Design an enzyme around this catalytic site. Structure first.
Site, short mmCIF file in Angstrom:
data_model
loop_
_atom_site.label_atom_id
_atom_site.label_comp_id
_atom_site.label_asym_id
_atom_site.label_seq_id
_atom_site.Cartn_x
_atom_site.Cartn_y
_atom_site.Cartn_z
N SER A 44 30.89 124.05 29.34
CA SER A 44 29.46 123.93 29.10
C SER A 44 28.74 124.84 30.05
CB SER A 44 29.02 122.51 29.29
OG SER A 44 29.75 121.66 28.44
N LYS A 66 38.90 115.96 30.84
CA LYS A 66 37.71 116.10 31.65
C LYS A 66 36.71 115.09 31.15
CE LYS A 66 34.01 119.16 32.73
NZ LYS A 66 33.24 120.28 32.31
N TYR A 126 37.89 116.98 26.31
CA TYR A 126 36.63 117.13 27.07
C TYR A 126 35.65 116.09 26.50
CZ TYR A 126 32.58 119.83 28.95
OH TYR A 126 31.45 120.23 29.63
N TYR A 138 28.27 118.10 16.24
CA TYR A 138 27.17 118.00 15.30
C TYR A 138 27.38 116.66 14.55
CZ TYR A 138 23.68 118.90 11.69
OH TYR A 138 22.60 118.76 10.89
C1 LIG Z 1 31.96 121.31 32.85
C2 LIG Z 1 31.23 120.76 34.04
C3 LIG Z 1 30.35 119.64 33.55
O1 LIG Z 1 30.55 119.48 32.11
C4 LIG Z 1 28.89 119.94 33.91
O2 LIG Z 1 28.07 118.99 33.23
C5 LIG Z 1 28.54 120.10 35.42
O3 LIG Z 1 29.20 119.31 36.45
C6 LIG Z 1 31.59 122.39 32.13
O4 LIG Z 1 32.29 122.71 31.15
O5 LIG Z 1 30.56 123.02 32.40
#
Ligand SMILES: *[C@H](C[C@H](O)[C@@H](O)CO)C(=O)O
Ligand SMILES: *[C@@H](C[C@H](O)[C@@H](O)CO)C(=O)O
Ligand SMILES: *[C@H](C[C@H](O)[C@@H](O)CO)C(=O)O
Ligand SMILES: *[C@H](C[C@H](O)[C@@H](O)CO)C(=O)O
Lengths: 298, 298, 298, 298
Positions: free
Chosen positions: C45, C163, C134, C108
């Site tokens: 992200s 994650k 994720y 979505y």
């Molecule tokens: C993961 C890190 C996460 O999702 C953010 O929200 C920041 O800690 C990423 O894929 O960016």
């Protein structure tokens, strides 16, 4: 500065006919005080305020305040949906000798912001006691946001703290920065066992959490360690508290679970609870037991 | 099928000191009965049950049932968070002559599905009156799903209906298909004014909605036109009901708005409401009035 | 256990025309590796996967894998809503040399459970690479529950981690007990900075969090201290991490904030971000700067 | 007022290999135009835009515009999370001869209000075509409120309508009062079949709904009846539309259901759908069939 540290939301012990069990509530109070807690909170969610009538709540508070007999600060939960009753219960608590009241936001209607500020201002004006706000957005459906809480503390100098019951580091952090930043001595207390440690590291003041009933020594020692600068000892207690809230999944409401925990940890009280809660079944009581044993709490 | 048609959730009229205003409540009941409603429902959300004490509620119900004097079927809202009090108020209602009780799910704790089924079954077994469920998830935070309602109606033959207060065509449709499909005579009533027409076309039975207080003729005429096969006339009344709920945005709670509308539509009752609701300000009362004028309701 | 420890979700550096800035992304990768991270995760992200086209994403992955040149494990985020494209990106990643892929659920349509399991099984079947799930329910609107995740790890032996990006101790704790209890070497990483420490104490494996870009040393030293049994030193670093996420409130998306922080902490990269994100204004940049200074990070 | 009346979100017909099936999409387009629809919308949620790549989307829009050959107005859905891609798809639509574009809000990140207004203003500035906004908060996680929509219409004179997909009478009424009250020719279309009639009675403009694919004559006839002042006839069609959305419960995504219904109602097209959607199983196909038979649609 007011109502800091470890303050359990005490279970109300009831007999098999659903009347106040005075010997069992008294013994529970005495265990807690001997364990070194910083105050006691009666008629919170754990104390089943929402399943009791107003006359019943007055009798319980009066009993409880009398039994405590000033050994530690006492808070009484006086909230509900009937605002006229909240003033009655709060004035009764002051008259009976309580040290503070804890007031949730109305949880049926989610009242407009103007009505909500007015509600808390009126309750605060009805007594000279300190007032602790109670946020529990998972049950109320209406969050007391850091900004709103700050506006309440700006408006009434007897609005001096908050029990923030939410599984959210961001909400605790932001409550602390926004409210304590404007009002250094405003008290922030977390309502979940597994947030005590972070609450302290964030600049907050302690916890009002269910495990205060059956394992107060873990929170009390965590706080004492933290106050002594022994952060690793504090973190060791935290590792237990991280695991405790597993048990709360056993039933909902889980006021049964907390009572069954008090028994298993060595205080034989009646575990009766008020409808719509119900007795915990034997297989889940054994599951509670194995959880407590794995954590070395019984 | 019991309790079908147009059944207003009657406002409770109070004096300035918050006591039941008997001449004003009576005048309101009489207006409603003259307007041709099919039943009256006292101490619903509009009747302010959640801001009243148990003894106040018993007095209100007793008065209301007495004044109605069996001219139309009477429902009493007995719900709350305190299940013991629910049983008390329900048994009181039966002894005071009510024709049915209306019971919302507990809205503090969202209790487990097993505690919830057991709560409704105990409430049902405490009386021999018909029982109407009350679903209002916006406020309760816990939906009574069509599958859950079906299970209650399968379990207790005196659970005979539901007031479904949700802005959702899908929820009403599914409540009708799932529950009325197993139980053809189970009554489905919507709780919003602007869903009455769709509820009827879906195979449902009517409405318990706030505009029943100040414009009962619109709902009453819509049902009559529908029952007569004059769908176009029904749809004309629907067009007015589609617009009414704009007013409910003027305040929250909007129990004040409903009373101010009772006055503007020609019945001069006292508009006091209980805290934490508050009086509607003069600019919003002027906005209500111009709305009622645009709809041709005063 | 695969992909444990501190694995930054690396920002993708862009020039003022929104093309891959190779010198800047390369210098960022190099800073991160020198800091002692255990792996690097591109196109999460924070790396802006959702604002990039498929060919752009392939180009970025290939560059990043080649630059890393096997110094530390490399994960590529290959998820999206277009499941055919997810397989293409995932097979591309494997061919280009990645060590693993990270796959969010489709965000979505929230697909039915059966379609969801089938989606991850097909993705997992398309490559021989390890697959990290994720979970980011704030953005996806669809939680990957511990029960679901266990089911996916039971079904495919290359689904080896998660994650879990959620401000929730309960979610982490439950993911760990449910999945790692059936699959002891299944990797649990938290996606928020301020959950690292708790993640470790609960039995989890590390973090993929934004502050890995601009202050990796805090996470890296926290993990090192924890692995050494110096819990108080770990808790010290945790105190900083508890505060960092304040900065994320500056903007949404906050991928601009992260890049502004990389610059402030001493790595002068272009801060360009792709629409619909936008450049951070100067007052907010100064705000970030004061937050970094208070935490002693620049 | 632009794009009013009945505008189906056309299903995209694919071959078994997931490519555009030109004969089947062409036949479906022609069936729709013959049934009297007022326009056609390609690459909405039901046209599977979110499971397609940008080059695929361009090829589909080009084909669909060309086939329609200006017999009715054509809209192309151009949105996504990649805002640079949204501009490319929208400028492509204009150059390909589309009459307007339909743009959903970004649905991964829920961008800040300032970023959201900028996003739509940038998309609207990139073409000289009319722009219809698309609200689908069940999927997006971020509502386009009537206030926000009004601000966008105040800002750009080519933002001239909204497709409001939400099961909420209040949301439709409020969108109509707030937006059409400031902008009388702004088009409000509902996205659910069972809100068409109410949308019309509220002062709105028609529907873009899934049943337009397989039973367009019901929406077309309802609108005709309404325009003719035959409200009873309109309400008879509404009764059928009230029942249709039961079928959408058969799967999620329900794009497969819509195509199975196209076949059952008499147009034999391929029912392939793109992953992560999947083929509808035979028992649910037989359920859809009996539903369509009960409604007299095949
Ligand atoms: C993961 C890190 C996460 O999702 C953010 O929200 C920041 O800690 C990423 O894929 O960016
Ligand atoms: C407060 C304690 C909180 O709210 C419980 O949920 C468990 O820690 C209470 O009033 O019971
Ligand atoms: C029932 C009517 C519903 O609930 C209101 O919300 C307004 O139509 C009631 O008990 O007041
Ligand atoms: C629009 C129609 C809406 O969004 C569906 O949910 C079905 O009526 C579309 O683009 O598919």
């Amino acid at each position: 500065a007011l109502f800091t540290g470890i303050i359990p939301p005490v279970s109300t012990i009831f007999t098999a006919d659903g009347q106040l069990d005075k010997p069992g509530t008294a013994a529970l109070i005495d265990d807690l005080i001997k364990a070194g807690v910083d105050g006691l909170f009666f008629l919170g969610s754990g104390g089943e305020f929402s399943q009791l009538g107003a006359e019943e709540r007055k009798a319980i508070a009066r009993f409880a305040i009398d039994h405590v007999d000033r050994r530690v600060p006492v808070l009484i939960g006086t909230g509900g949906t009937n605002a006229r009753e909240t003033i009655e219960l709060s004035q009764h608590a002051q008259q009976a000798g309580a040290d503070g009241i804890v007031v949730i936001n109305p949880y049926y209607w989610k009242v407009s912001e103007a009505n909500l500020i007015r509600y808390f201002e009126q309750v605060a004006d009805s007594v000279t006691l300190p007032v602790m706000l109670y946020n529990f957005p998972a049950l109320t459906g209406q969050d007391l946001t850091p900004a709103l809480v700050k506006t309440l503390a700006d408006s009434r100098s007897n609005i001096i703290g908050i029990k923030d019951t939410i599984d959210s580091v961001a909400h605790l952090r932001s409550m602390i920065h926004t409210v304590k930043g404007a009002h250094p001595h405003f008290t922030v207390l977390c309502g979940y066992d597994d947030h005590l440690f972070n609450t302290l590291l964030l600049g907050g003041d302690g916890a009002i959490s269910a495990s205060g009933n059956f394992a107060p020594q873990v929170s009390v020692n965590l706080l004492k360690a933290w106050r002594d600068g022994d952060v690793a000892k504090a973190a060791g207690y935290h590792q237990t508290l991280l695991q405790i809230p597993q048990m709360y999944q056993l039933d909902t409401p889980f006021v049964n679970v907390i009572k069954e925990a008090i028994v298993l940890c060595g205080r034989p009280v009646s575990t009766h609870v008020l409808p719509p809660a119900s007795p915990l079944d034997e297989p889940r009581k054994a599951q509670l037991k194995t959880l407590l044993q794995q954590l070395k709490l019984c």
